[PDB]
Amino acid sequence: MEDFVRQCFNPMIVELAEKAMKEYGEDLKIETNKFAAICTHLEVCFMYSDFHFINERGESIIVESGDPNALLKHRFEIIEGRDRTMAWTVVNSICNTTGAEKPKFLPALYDYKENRFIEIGVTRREVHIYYLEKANKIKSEKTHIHIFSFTGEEMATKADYTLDEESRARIKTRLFTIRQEMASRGLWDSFRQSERGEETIEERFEITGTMRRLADQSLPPNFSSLENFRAYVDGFEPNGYIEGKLSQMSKEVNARIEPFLKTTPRPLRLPDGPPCSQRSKFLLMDALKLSIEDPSHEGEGIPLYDAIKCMRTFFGWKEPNVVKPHEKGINPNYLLAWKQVLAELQDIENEEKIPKTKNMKKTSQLKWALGENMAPEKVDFDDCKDVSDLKQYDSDEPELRSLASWIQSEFNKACELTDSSWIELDEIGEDVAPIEHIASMRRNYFTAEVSHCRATEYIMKGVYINTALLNASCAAMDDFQLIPMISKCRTKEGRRKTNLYGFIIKGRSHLRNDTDVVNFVSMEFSLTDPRLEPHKWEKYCVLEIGDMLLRSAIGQVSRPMFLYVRTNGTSKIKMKWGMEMRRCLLQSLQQIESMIEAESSVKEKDMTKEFFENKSETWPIGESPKGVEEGSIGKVCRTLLAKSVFNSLYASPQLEGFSAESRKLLLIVQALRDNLEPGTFDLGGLYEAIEECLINDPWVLLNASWFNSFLTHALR
């Protein structure tokens, strides 16, 4: 029947009716009668609107066709067939400008001279019922209503047909002709008996074709079609299927509880292999500092000028020579790299002005040390197919290494109290509330007990090094810079100082992914002779550069000075998380604050003062031959801060895995120590998971050693 609707009406009317049907979601293929009804209503309203043009005053010319004028002044403004959004927008605009009452439902047209709406409908049912439904639907109707039935019956409110009777006759002729065509076709009865269901819309989503053929294959094994499965599920009623299958299931599937007792846990199985070596990006325990008193803060000053000034204080420089080769490198290259750095410092010093940053010359020594041209050339697989040695990238388990004694000593030295002030925090908003005063007192205590720790020196070193490397690699992506290490502190008497640990020489740093590597040969001063712990300096190339003359409790001692050269690398994510290293202070201080507040809750008064000064209640921290040694709250704070700093410095996947799998066992042990009667389903699996993480990371091995010691002391 699509031919009737497509032919008997104008193309524009059918087009906009198609748009309306698509808007409401219907499909013309199924609800053809609704399509015809929509087209007929639209034609009725358009014939109502057309051929009416108001003028200066309240009258119209009602031309027949093709009689426009500069004074358009359209008598009607069609509202129907505009889309819901546009229709409501225009209705609201005209109602606002005129100030009338907006009809609840969408009208058909509007009257400008009279300033009221008009509603027009087409009905197959009895006209009077439709008219009264329209009238009662339009609450407090100020809008004229008009009804046009096919048989010709007409009605309205007050019989105020404000239209030319010729237009009425034309619409009557159009409707009569449409009725004649429908009767000739024979769908007129269907239209008459189909108007009841046109208003309601039913969603007709369905599955057919390929989707149904996929649905018939996505059921439990013993079902054949989706409809059968739905029929089965709908008729489903519970009849003890679970309790019936439990007995049928094997009795080997159980969750036997194995009690956890004081004897159950065993020491973790630390790996075995060659001792581990240093892996941090800068020396921690063996870090000399060439200092010079300087009234500057934080970032004030040009780093190169500060570095050269510090270098011009130590007068004991000798001719460098290697004293602990790299065992895998071209050490003469390291020696020449140091020579070149020293010559370049002399060069910059001789210059008039000090450049903000200095780019090193691209010599063979830096070229090899920084690994330039090392990457194999990228090639497509079409030609590099028959190559004899073509393989997959070596992806094997990391080499196993055992725990050395040096990491414990480094962690020991990274908790002592220095005689400087490595962190100087800015001011904060003036305190008013008493909580602010109490917080200020407690914060003075904390920042005094943490500013003097050496872990804070490591924090500041790491932050500065990573910031400098990131900024230099983001700007000079093609030149070898020279980034001296700097750190500033206040002595015990308050005098400011600036320090110079060594130098970094960033390599080519075209970083694309947040895991790429920028190689930087790191040159560091130190006073510790490598021929004492040779298994620790595996990847360095120590040189002997000078001979200091330091003053001690005995006076002049004259120890030699060493330079620990090495290559190294760091990615764009390690640099970011090294720049963000100041959260260690927050972690440790939050823990200490929690402990102090927990104690002070019991005793209704602040306990920080006696905690930090009276050397009151102490916690078990550390392990000496005499047993476990207690430590004051200050040492607990410093130890936790050092632990956080080392977590940041020696971060690796092994640490994450071990931390989780060991927190599990720690909670089990704590539950045991609280007489809660713990119980485990598979403890051996937990131990195997824990022991899989300890591979070669020195920090992870040290943590496992601590855990073994804790298990020994606990449960006993």
Binding site: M285, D286, A287, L288, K289, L290, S291, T313, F314, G316, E416, L417, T418, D419, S420, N444, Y445, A448, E449, H452, L527, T528, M548, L549, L550, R551, S552, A553, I554, V557, F612, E613, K615, S632, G634, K635
Partner: peptide
């Protein structure tokens, strides 16, 4: 408040290995 660690050993070490004096100062 001035921190004071019982293990201070402020006189134990003849010189701080990291932060020495070297210079005549």
């Amino acid at each position: 408040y001035s921190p004071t660690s019982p293990s201070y050993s402020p006189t134990s070490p003849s010189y701080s290995p990291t932060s020495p004096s070297y210079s005549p100062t």
